Design a protein around this ligand. Structure first.
Ligand SMILES: CN1CCC(OC(=O)c2cccc(F)c2)CC1
Length: 291
């Protein structure tokens, strides 16, 4: 799967909010482009003169994520974050020249990402009471990954001392994206666990935090809530469900070629961190069938 690489696999079946520290610092920002940020401004002007209803928004930038020694006490993960924007994304990661920017960042900074916006996404492996995961179909008309399968998620917007507020906004935002797109009540959702971080190589290496969330509704009840919003209550064009039993071998199915890279990231991390049991009971052949 060349279009997704794992930056982080969390221990303990995934990390809760209270085990994660953030460092939000301008040291973690994108570096100015070699020929100046005027190249970003030019791409943005061209875009607004065609679609003048577009607006900019701030975004979190992922610099790096350091895990503690396994089995340790205290905070288990440090997220190093800076700030970026939708405008900086369109002029860097989404640019036709994005590979040239990666090569120049290797040359100048020893860092393929130094000249990239790299906005942090969030996605969820969302499980129902009857043991299915939730999938959404993307419109065939949008710019990014048209007609492909996604999971719930989005790109959160700003507003360890300022750190703990940032970690809270990341966890909050994955629940808000589920309520906004799937139309589920907030009280049917568990607190999220962070499973890991995946990178989208088709989008010059921009990263998404992938989370596990449990819902107290069945697949039939989740479907009713999604549909009862009507066509204007969601950006996706349809909802569907795959048994957690069958998610184990999804990379061997025809579905795999229709999944966008960030959804492939969510499913690989679900399989390694929530699946793949370590104990004698769940690891027994009748419960973990070979092959
Ligand atoms: C929904 N509608 C209006 C907004 C358009 O998108 C944006 O201009 C945009 C939306 C969110 C964040 C952002 F930075 C930019 C898409 C069509």
């Amino acid at each position: 799967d060349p279009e997704v690489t794992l930056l982080l696999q969390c221990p303990g079946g995934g990390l809760p909010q209270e085990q994660i520290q953030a460092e939000l610092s301008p040291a973690h920002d994108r570096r100015p482009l070699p020929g100046g940020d005027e190249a970003i401004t030019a791409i943005w002007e061209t875009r607004l003169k065609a679609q003048p209803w577009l607006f900019d928004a701030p975004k979190f930038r992922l610099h790096s994520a350091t895990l503690a020694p396994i089995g340790s006490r205290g905070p288990q993960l440090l997220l190093r974050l800076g700030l970026t924007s939708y405008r900086d994304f369109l002029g860097t990661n989404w640019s036709s020249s994005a590979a040239w920017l990666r090569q120049q960042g290797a040359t100048d900074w020893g860092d393929t990402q130094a000249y990239l916006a790299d906005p942090l996404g969030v996605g969820a492996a969302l499980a129902t009471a009857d043991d299915f995961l939730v999938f959404l179909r993307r419109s065939r008309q949008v710019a990014e990954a048209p007609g492909l399968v996604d999971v719930p998620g989005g790109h959160p917007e700003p507003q360890d001392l300022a750190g703990q507020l940032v970690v809270h906004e990341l966890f909050s935002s994955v629940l808000q994206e589920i309520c906004d797109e799937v139309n589920l009540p907030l009280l049917t959702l568990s607190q999220p666990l962070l499973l890991g971080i995946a990178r989208n190589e088709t989008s010059a290496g921009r990263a998404s935090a992938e989370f596990y969330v449990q819902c107290s509704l069945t697949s039939e009840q989740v479907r009713k809530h999604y549909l009862s919003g009507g066509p204007e209550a969601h950006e996706s064009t349809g909802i569907f469900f795959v048994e957690t039993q069958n998610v184990r071998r999804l990379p061997e199915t025809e579905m795999w070629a229709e999944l966008c890279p960030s959804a492939k990231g969510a499913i690989i991390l679900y399989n390694r961190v929530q699946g793949s049991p370590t104990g004698a009971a769940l690891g027994s052949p009748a419960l973990l069938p070979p092959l």
